[PDB]
Amino acid sequence: SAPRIMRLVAECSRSGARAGELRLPHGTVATPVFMPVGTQATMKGITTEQLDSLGCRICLGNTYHLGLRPGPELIRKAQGLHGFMNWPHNLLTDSGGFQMVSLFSLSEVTEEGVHFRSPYDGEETLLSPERSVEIQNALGSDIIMQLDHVVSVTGPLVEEAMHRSVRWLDRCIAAHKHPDKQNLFAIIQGGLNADLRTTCLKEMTKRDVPGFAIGGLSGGESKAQFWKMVALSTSMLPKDKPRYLMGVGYATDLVVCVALGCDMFDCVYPTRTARFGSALVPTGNLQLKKKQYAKDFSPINPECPCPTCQTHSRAFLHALLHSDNTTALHHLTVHNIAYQLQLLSAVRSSILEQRFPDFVRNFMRTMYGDHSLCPAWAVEALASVGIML
Amino acid sequence: PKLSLIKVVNGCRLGKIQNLGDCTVDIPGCLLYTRTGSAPHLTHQTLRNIHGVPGIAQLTLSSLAEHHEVLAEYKKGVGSFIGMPESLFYCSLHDPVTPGPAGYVTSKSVSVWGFGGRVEMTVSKFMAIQEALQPDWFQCLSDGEASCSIKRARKSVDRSLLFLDSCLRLQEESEVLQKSVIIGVIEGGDVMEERLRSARETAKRPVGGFLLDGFQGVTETRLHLLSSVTAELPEDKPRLICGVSRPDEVLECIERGVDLFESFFPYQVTERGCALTFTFDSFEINLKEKKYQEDFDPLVRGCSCYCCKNHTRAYIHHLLMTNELLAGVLLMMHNFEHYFGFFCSIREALKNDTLAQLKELICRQM
Ligand SMILES: [Zn+2]
Ligand SMILES: [Zn+2]
Numbered sequence: 001s002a003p004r005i006m007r008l009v010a011e012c013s014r015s016g017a018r019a020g021e022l023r024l025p026h027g028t029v030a031t032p033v034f035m036p037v038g039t040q041a042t043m044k045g046i047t048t049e050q051l052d053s054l055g056c057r058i059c060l061g062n063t064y065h066l067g068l069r070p071g072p073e074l075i076r077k078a079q080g081l082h083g084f085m086n087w088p089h090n091l092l093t094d095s096g097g098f099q100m101v102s103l104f105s106l107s108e109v110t111e112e113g114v115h116f117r118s119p120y121d122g123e124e125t126l127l128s129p130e131r132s133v134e135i136q137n138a139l140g141s142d143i144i145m146q147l148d149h150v151v152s153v154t155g156p157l158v159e160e161a162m163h164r165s166v167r168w169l170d171r172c173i174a175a176h177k178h179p180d181k182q183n184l185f186a187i188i189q190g191g192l193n194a195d196l197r198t199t200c201l202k203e204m205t206k207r208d209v210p211g212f213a214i215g216g217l218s219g220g221e222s223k224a225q226f227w228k229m230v231a232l233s234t235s236m237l238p239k240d241k242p243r244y245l246m247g248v249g250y251a252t253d254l255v256v257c258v259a260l261g262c263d264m265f266d267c268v269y270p271t272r273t274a275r276f277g278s279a280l281v282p283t284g285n286l287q288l289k290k291k292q293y294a295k296d297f298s299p300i301n302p303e304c305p306c307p308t309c310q311t312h313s314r315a316f317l318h319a320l321l322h323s324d325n326t327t328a329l330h331h332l333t334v335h336n337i338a339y340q341l342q343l344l345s346a347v348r349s350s351i352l353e354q355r356f357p358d359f360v361r362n363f364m365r366t367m368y369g370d371h372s373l374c375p376a377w378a379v380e381a382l383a384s385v386g387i388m389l
Numbered sequence: 390p391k392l393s394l395i396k397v398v399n400g401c402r403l404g405k406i407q408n409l410g411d412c413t414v415d416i417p418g419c420l421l422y423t424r425t426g427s428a429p430h431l432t433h434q435t436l437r438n439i440h441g442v443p444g445i446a447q448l449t450l451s452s453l454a455e456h457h458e459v460l461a462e463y464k465k466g467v468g469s470f471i472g473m474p475e476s477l478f479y480c481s482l483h484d485p486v487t488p489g490p491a492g493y494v495t496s497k498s499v500s501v502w503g504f505g506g507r508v509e510m511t512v513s514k515f516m517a518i519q520e521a522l523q524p525d526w527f528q529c530l531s532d533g534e535a536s537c538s539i540k541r542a543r544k545s546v547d548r549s550l551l552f553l554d555s556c557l558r559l560q561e562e563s564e565v566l567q568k569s570v571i572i573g574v575i576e577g578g579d580v581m582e583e584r585l586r587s588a589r590e591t592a593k594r595p596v597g598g599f600l601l602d603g604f605q606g607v608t609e610t611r612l613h614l615l616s617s618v619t620a621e622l623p624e625d626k627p628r629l630i631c632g633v634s635r636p637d638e639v640l641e642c643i644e645r646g647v648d649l650f651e652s653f654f655p656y657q658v659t660e661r662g663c664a665l666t667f668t669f670d671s672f673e674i675n676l677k678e679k680k681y682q683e684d685f686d687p688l689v690r691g692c693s694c695y696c697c698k699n700h701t702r703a704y705i706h707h708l709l710m711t712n713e714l715l716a717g718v719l720l721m722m723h724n725f726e727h728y729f730g731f732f733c734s735i736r737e738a739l740k741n742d743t744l745a746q747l748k749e750l751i752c753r754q755m
Contacts, residue, residue: 103711108679152712155661222504224489376455376506 005183005210006031006242006263012356015259015385019351022058022242024142025181026082026090029058030348031242031263034249034340035092036271037062038085044274044333048086054306054334055341057089060266061141063096063132072138080140092266093139095132095147095172109149111164129171133184141182146172148187148215162189162200169207179210185244187215188233192225201236211242214262218247223377227256231384234261251280251343255363256381258347259356270340274332277321280339282366286314288332293318306338307331357387364389390570390597392416392625396739400616400644403739406627409525412477414444416627416648417739419634419732420479421446421725422656424486425503426453426471428725429656430717433472438695439722441729445477447651448524449484451501454508457518466523466565479572480524482531485605485632485653491537496548499530512555520563526570526597529553533602535578542578545603546587549576553594570597572629575618578603584614588621598627601647605632612641619646636667636731637755640748643735655724662709664688664720665727669734669747672754674702676720681706694726695719 010019020031038059041051051059061081066072070084078084081091097114098106107115113128129147136144146169149161169186176184186204190197204212214233217226230245237243242263248254249267257265270280277289279300286293286300299309300317308317308331320328350359360382368374371389379389394404406414421428421436421443428436428446436442453460453467463470468478482501483489489502493509500509510518515530530552535545553573560566573596577583591599599622604611619628627648633639634654642650658665663673666689674681674688687697688705696705696719708716738744 108677108710153661154657155663157661222487222502224502224505228490377504380506 002179002208002210004240006240008240010352010354012259012351013354014357015382015387016261017259017347017351017356017385018261018263019348020242020263024058024090024183026088026142027057029090030345032254032258032344032347033058033264034254034344035060035264035266036337036340037266037268038087038091039065040268040271041333041337042085045330046334046337048088050307050334051337052089054338055345056337058092058142059087059089061091061093061139062100063093063135063139064099064101066093066139067096067135072135075140076138080138082140090143091139091141092143092145093136093141094145095127095129096135097127097132097147098150109161109164111167113147129168130175133172133175137176137178137182143183143185143211144176145185145213146187146209148189150189150215151191152220153191158189158191158193159196162191162196165189166200166203169204169209173207173209183210185209185211185213185242187213187246188237189216191216192221192229194229194232197229197232198236201233205236205238211244212237213244213246213264215246217245218267223375224380227260227377227381230257230262231260231381237261249340251340252364252367252375252378254340254343255347255360256378259360259382259385259387265344271333271336274329274336277328277332279317279332280336282363284367288314288318289321290318300335301339304335304338304342306335308335308338360387361389392627394624398739398742399744400646401739401744402624402646402648403736404648409444409477412444414477414649415736417639417643417650417732417735418648419443419650419652419729420629422652423448424452424484424656426467428721429659430714430721431725435695435718435722439726439729440693441726441733443652443729443732445479445525446473448478448480448522450480450482450518450522450528451484451487451489452503453480453522454501454510454518455503455505457508457521460521461517463521467521468523477526478524479526479528479629480519480522481528481600481631481651483533483631485634485651486657491534494532494534494548496544496551499532512552513559516556516559516563516566519569520565523565524569526572528572528600529556529574529596531574531600531602532576533574535576535580535583536603539580539583542576542580542583545576545578546583546590549574549587550590553591553596557594572596572598572600574600574602575622576602577614579610579614581614581617584618585621588618592622596626598629601628601630604630604642607633607638607641612645615642615647616645622646636669636728636751640735640744640751643744652725652728655728656721659717659720659724662716662720664705665724667727667731667754668750669731670737676702676705676716677709678706688720688723689727692723692726694723696723696726 008020022029036059116125132147148165151161186209190200244264245262278285293314296314350356390408392406396403404416493500498509498511500507532545532548535542573591575587577587629649630647662677663675681702684702738747
């Protein structure tokens, strides 16, 4: 058995929610953890020092966009993504086959790999499992993801893509020559089909990879199907390895999925709400473009430690959203990332002090009010692990 | 409200359900399939132009029960709420495509799931929800999980008769439900003795019709249970069946006295990106296949649906590859039109005494 990268430091005595640590090459990461996308932060003017100061010790790189600009060869010459973008902490990259790739740019998947289209009937580009590993090797990220056959879908394609993802996992494992330097994660597929997802869990966990992600659940399905598939996945994934739930990041989703056994999360959308003027708060969000904030001289959240809340009022941000929008979006993006990192930090602290069910009750009461106003799916999911509201 | 048989031929009932009070429903026939109160991917306006649309639509309690509070405030019923105030609605308990988890039935309640959380329904809660929905017909609260052991099967019959008697009592006291029709539910699982008892005892109650529950695949053993059950039911009330929609299975059940079918099969075909092509006067084609990228024929040559008269396979292929909702719109239009045309051909075949020939035409293509 390969050395384990995770240890558990505490488990909720009621629910089993996990507080852990990942020993990665650019530092230890506390779990549960929300992982922002680095380039989404740099697009909004966020420096390494600013993101470090928010407590971030791991962020995502989107392999498709990095592979377009600046491209893998340039990143290789820069001695990896850490060197190129001046980031000293950990990086997680995906396979580059589907995340943030338009379906307009994708031809049909074949056994050889993913096929990209070029404009105006140009020549296509193949991304094989082996080339995906080679690219991520050049990026030098601390966690690299297998190439999987992602589908949006009913019928035989779900089962066919699930089994192809298993075959591609094996090919990525064979291609990845330095597990001492980068950690390859498998990605559980099978859609919303319990039998297919059970099969994928049974087969992929026969491979001794350092971590497992839960794929195919970020959007489209009912909330009932969503949390049942998360719980199915965590019931079968190894306890002694991390569980990374991909594409999930709304606050309530995060809290519930930690309760269900997940360790790592990513999502572009809560932070991207900043682009529309919305600031994340324990009661949900403030829409700072609204006229009621024009003379509101309090910060977004007096108890938020982010630079925006230490420095600026709602009124100032409201004025900037209208008259100097680019500056406003920097401030709101900093704050929204801060909220996500603060939320997960508070979740983790509560597990360590064995008060996680109390934390969940306070989180839900602040966000929604009485239990009859809480989302029914979340009440049911929490009850399934013993947390009553 | 009356079922009048036009002709009975070889165990197959050809007729019409009248005074539904200017509305008619043809038998054998299907009910329009809906999800969360909409025909999937189709608007009121598009549905109007599909040829052969059934005279009654199916609603699913599992997709509507979580909206009870708003419907109760609306007061005027779910048909009006969803913008179809003059349409006829039958409300089933479960959705045949997304039936949710098993094992939650007791002698006191049944649970359903829509988008969000479990809705647990006692008899009084179930009837309160039906008072908000005010459907024209509704399946009675019932235990259909026997085969999901004579002990388990005997309980499904007794639970369902207790539910039936309790719901009939509450309907007597409900002003709004005086114009709604309860559908009795035949249970009993795969135990012949219980099936017959469920059939005979449910027929003793003043229900408007019967739902044959638990036959979803359809084995030859269950087909014999089915004909055994329908022999015990009165001729002058309609027989509905759930979870049976594929054309070959439909024909087998019609031969055994079943009148009304759910139309979720053409929806399933749409959701896998496919188009029904079987002749009723390949069985389906998969429009994601590369052979359709340059195919400028319609889905079905000679089809008069809005998809086939105005669009090509090539365009539908492209819409699927880019995940556009228009692909589901066009495929659903065609698949409903094709499936309803199949049911029209069944009734025409009964009129001409050629159902056996149509049955072989369908089987040939499978
Ligand atoms: Zn802040
Ligand atoms: Zn057509």
